[model samples]
Target: ASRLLLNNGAKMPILGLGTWKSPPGQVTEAVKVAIDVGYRHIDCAHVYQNENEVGVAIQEKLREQVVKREELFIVSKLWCTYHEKGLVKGACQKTLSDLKLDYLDLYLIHWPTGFKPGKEFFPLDESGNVVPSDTNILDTWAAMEELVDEGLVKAIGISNFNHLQVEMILNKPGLKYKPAVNQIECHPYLTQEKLIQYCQSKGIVVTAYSPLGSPDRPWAKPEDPSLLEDPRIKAIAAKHNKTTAQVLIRFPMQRNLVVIPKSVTPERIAENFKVFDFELSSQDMTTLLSYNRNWRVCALLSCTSHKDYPFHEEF
Candidate 1:
């Protein structure tokens, strides 16, 4: 239930419920349970293809007097396909319509690169590679600024953007709004300490995505490691009588970073919010931090050839 102040004078709940990979058929109930468990931040993405179901849960909660629309911090992202300056607003409007909200609490540039603009979200080539578009991030950001001027999104931020890309936006001439947050794939495997420090130094809050290492991700390989099952983490969790997921979730909260851990199961969703009861010791924090390997779980490999691929840099 803790909140962090954004650059634009908006306060967002530090903890949010992620809807990515949350099935459309099941996310509505999942969201309802999250709201019931006292989660105010619901992280949604247009590309997730489940905003309509998230909307159902929102409308139901509002109608039943469980929470007001103003009390919820609903976040959505602009997909790569809509990065063209003219297309950005339309993409945001589509998400607003699907989520059934007038204005989003936070809207993000989903990725730095753009794809061929069209209904086909992933326009591919003959070799099964994603087709690229040359629409630069500044143009897309300018369009995003227009959304703020027009009140379509309350706060605009970036996702999966490296420190250099974030600096480019911050130093842009005549920039109206600094990006309020930078959401990235962060956990022990990918500590992202430098990036988080850089963003926070400039007053940009960093939101940790895939904090549980995204065990349910479709791109995962058979030989991939699991953060939830690590013995070091398990030992810490056992010391605290908490689930490994809880320890993973608390790792970021203790760092003063925003975290969105996804779950549709009622008990797991509820359990994810019980971190306020205790704190992880400094030693536990160090043990978790010691596990950093620059091993990222969500690499967005399809866009590696794009002009602004974020992961190629050392940050």
Candidate 2:
């Protein structure tokens, strides 16, 4: 697998297997199979609620000498509920415990929206709305920097952050380290060209989540647009003699962004890993770029009311 160098001079694989929504029953095997099939990066999150199973697979692989810990790039995130003061390290420690690793290759802020710190992951109000926390995101970010000093995490980044949000982090007066990557929902429908360029300018890498249109996203409606079914993308895929899934995965790679596509099926996992053999022509790239509808598959509408909600600004 090819790798991209981050601002911190660490190499990250250009492609990874996402574990979000990967069912508990199959995800352990999925991680093992993915590692056996040449995947070096495994994207994980605490909110996914399946890290323990994923860890089981990883521990088995390590025990069998399939891959050493140093050879794998394991990425996990900090959930909103842990954004409160003095809680960030404990949250990361919990994820590390669940994943059975002493250190993480990359750790991220899952979302800008902070939730009320409580036993519940999603604290609710009397009106059945999400309760917001008073913690400033930068304050949480400061705590993340501490993890690096303690050798708990190698790199720290953000997810679902828009342009201004990233700027706020970048422009902080006492900033210690620049975020290495910004993971976002990106595909042909939501090209995010400007945001990609902006992050690159600051030496921040962009990781595209939901690269295959997130067909299995929980909130997806039947009427929502499908990037894989579009004629233009299909035509491009046919031209390259590839599957729509392959084209979607390749789109972000060609733009110099890391892409993590999720699949628990072994066949689909193998198929998604076969994209490096082909390249899209300039014309095909242009045509695919034209399909941008400013569409976002992971709009995260549920967090819209939060003061730190990120989607309102144009990326």
Candidate 3:
């Protein structure tokens, strides 16, 4: 696997396994198999509701001496409900306890919008609309910085943030640390070229979530386009003698971006991690670039009314 150097001089693997929507029963074995198959990075979130299972596999792997603690790069997110200043540390601690780890390699703000801090992950009103809170992201970021000082997390970052939103954090006074990453949805349909370049210019690495266009996303409609079934991509795959999934996974890595594709099946888990054997030519890359449609798979439309919703910009 290829590694990219972060602003803090830490090495992050360019490819990782995403655990979103991974069934509870299958995620444990999938995680163990991923590590056994040479995957050192694992992308997780509190909203995924499967951290306990992932932790079980991690612990078993450690006991079996499959991989040491320091050899893996584990990334988890702080959910929107925990964006309140006082709730940040407690949220991180809970995730740590669930993952059975002392510290995280990287921690991120899951979403820019903040919900009412409570037992409910999605605090909804009587009308079923999401209840919003006034907790500003800057306040959340300040608490995250404290996590670094407390030795709870080695690095912290923002996810689903637009370019201007990132500039806010970059230009904030008394900024203790620059964000090391800005993870977003990126695939052929939503290339995110400008956003990726903007993040790179600021020395913040871009991690591509849902790199295979999130075909399994719950909110996907019947009319939604499937990236893996596109004929143009299939032509390129045939030319290279690779599967369309491999083509989509390789495209982001060729552009020097971190990518995380999720899978719970053992065969698919190994298939998603096998992208290092071949290289896409420059011409093939340009052809793939032409397919960009600015299509977003994970558009949080429900929270569009929130003050800090990030997809309002052209990013």
Candidate 4:
């Protein structure tokens, strides 16, 4: 399943399924075992509070017919205390009513700073505090472009945002949705190369989010830098015989980004959904992106003292 269309044309699925920390009763059997091992894409978030058990395993895989929410692309987010503007469309309609989905093939804005709405994850005050409220990350990206013209969202984005908060939400102002996707934290030790070339020069669409570099992150830190034993990505996953999470999911689907990689069993979600059989070799994908040593494994707002702390800045 290879797609990536979204400038509102809507498609995105170079490879998905990343329920952040999947636990909470195993995210409804890990989204029904990552779409029964084929995975038609998923990224979701309401700061990972398990969207009502990943929307009861995506409506029990579309009520057992097993897939068809228009071929599944569902990616959600938008929670930094719902960036005020009157709680950003009721916090993205409460994560589209707890992922019991009525819309949203894409919606993101996970963090670029904003807090104070009815705390959950990053919240603390009263003399032992952390607050950073200048968050108008483009007025929560203009209420995520008014939830995509009230259709509730077919697209909208920005996650772990950078590139000057995506060039100030792509220079907003009466803008009707332009950020189709931005999700971040790409791997090989955080190789977010110029923020993936400035989100492919503004055509947007960047999605990695710990592609195997998250390693079931429970604040993963044993000196943290391991994009799965990076010795040039384990010698390019032993020359593509693959398995370093399928060489980190074909190195971000050969740069046409959109990754997600999360697991809660079913044989590691069928070995992280077998990377389109196998490929990778442009000199082993430039020596696996020179194992890009900028190492980062989700420092949740870089241990916070946030004045908009996005890893100090490198896109």
Candidate 5:
């Protein structure tokens, strides 16, 4: 029932119900089940194209007075197509209309990159070239700052951004709202130590996505190690009388990071939502941290055309 206060003076719950991979047809039931199981924070995005279903679950709860509009902390993201300054407000409004909510407690620039307006989702043409466009990410981010002024959103943040991008935006003038949080792919394998440290130094909160190493992630490499099945992690889970899933959620909490793990099953949703009950010992915490091997689960290198494909660093 409690929440973590953001740098912008908003309370984001330590745990959130992630709906990224929730199938469109089943998302409505997934959301309803999540709410019934005691999840107050819901993570969504326009790119997912399932807000209609999410809206159903929200309205269902409201009609029964199971939760009030203000009692729920709804989070959505601004997609690449809406990266243009003129399109940002409308994008937020679209999510509002889709979710059937009056306002968003937290809105985020889904990605730190931008695409041209007419050419929304596809960053390339049939021939596969990086299309030059005027809709830069910072331009879109500046527009996101205006949502608070228009009273459509309470706070704003970003996802999947590197330290340089955050610093660039921080240097921009007339930034009405500083990004309160940076949601990134973080887990025992893909722990982002430098970026997390940078965000914290700049007074921004860091939230971890795919906290379980994205075991169920649709497209996975054949050689990647499973953080969920790692021997060290399993050993720690055994000691604590918890499942590997619980240990995964606890890993982020131990670092004071908020985590949003997606689940469409009733039992898994309840199992994940119950993680706030205990703490990991210092030794166990160290053991977990030691598993950080610069492993990345959601590497975007496969999308070879994007200008910022993440795997080119040769780390």
Candidate 6:
């Protein structure tokens, strides 16, 4: 039930239900269960291609009076294809229309790297290469600031941006507002200590996506380490009488980071939301903190050669 006070004075729920890779056929019910289980924040992205389906659940709940629009925090992201200054408004408008909302609680730049600005989401080349857009992220941020001025979005943020990339915007000459949060791949395996600390010092909150190791991530391979099955995490879970999933979710929350764990299972949705009842001890916290191996499940390797590649930095 706790929330993060954004640098822009917005209050966002610290715990949220993630919608990435949640199949459209099941996302409506997934979101319904999230709302039924006391989740206030629903983290979504236009790139997820499921906002329309997610909107159905949101529409049902709002009309049913299960939750008021203002009481629930709704978030969406601006995909790379829309990063060009002129396209930012169109992107937000589309998301607003699909989500059936007048204003987005938060809108984020989905990634620092931009794809070719076109109808195709990926915009690949004939040679199987992703055509890159050289649009300056600074240009994109300026355009995003206009949405707040015109009342289409309340707060704006960025995702998958490394520290230097964030600093570039933080020091932009005509910056109107700073990014409120930076959502990135996070779990015990990729603790992101320096990156989180950097954002913390600069008043930008960190949002941990795939906090449960993203076991269901489409890109995950057979040999990737399992956060839920790790013996050490299991040991901690046994001590707290909670599932390893719960321990993983609470790990970032204990650090005061916003955490979004995606699950379509009703029981797992409820399980992920029940971290409020117990507190992990200092020892438990230390154990989880020491397990970082800099592992990332969502490493966007396709565009590593792009000038805006964010994973090149130390933090």
Residue-wise C-alpha lDDT for candidate 2, range 99-201, written one tens digit per residue: 9999999999999989999888888887678888998879989999999999999999999999999999999889998899999988888889999999999
lDDT of 4 by residue, 25-85 (tens): 9879977888888888878788888888988888988999988799988888877777767
Indicate the residue-level lDDT of 91 in model 2. Answer: 95
Model 1 spans > 4 angstroms off? none
Pairs of residues clashing in candidate 1: none
Query: What range of 10 consecutive residues in model 3 has the weakest lDDT sum?
Result: 294-303
What's the lDDT of the predicted structure labeled candidate 5? 0.82
On residues 56-120, what C-alpha lDDT tens digit does candidate 6 reach at each position? Answer: 99999999999999998999999989889999999999999999899999999999988999889
Model 4 deviation from the true structure expressed as Cα RMSD, one decimal place = 17.2
Q: TM-score for each prediction?
A: 0.98, 0.97, 0.98, 0.34, 0.92, 0.98
Pairs that collide, model 3 = none
Clashes of 1: 0
Candidate 4 similarity to native, TM-score: 0.34
Model 1: how far residue 181 lies from native, Å: 0.3
TM-score of 3: 0.98
Better of 2 and 4 by lDDT: 2
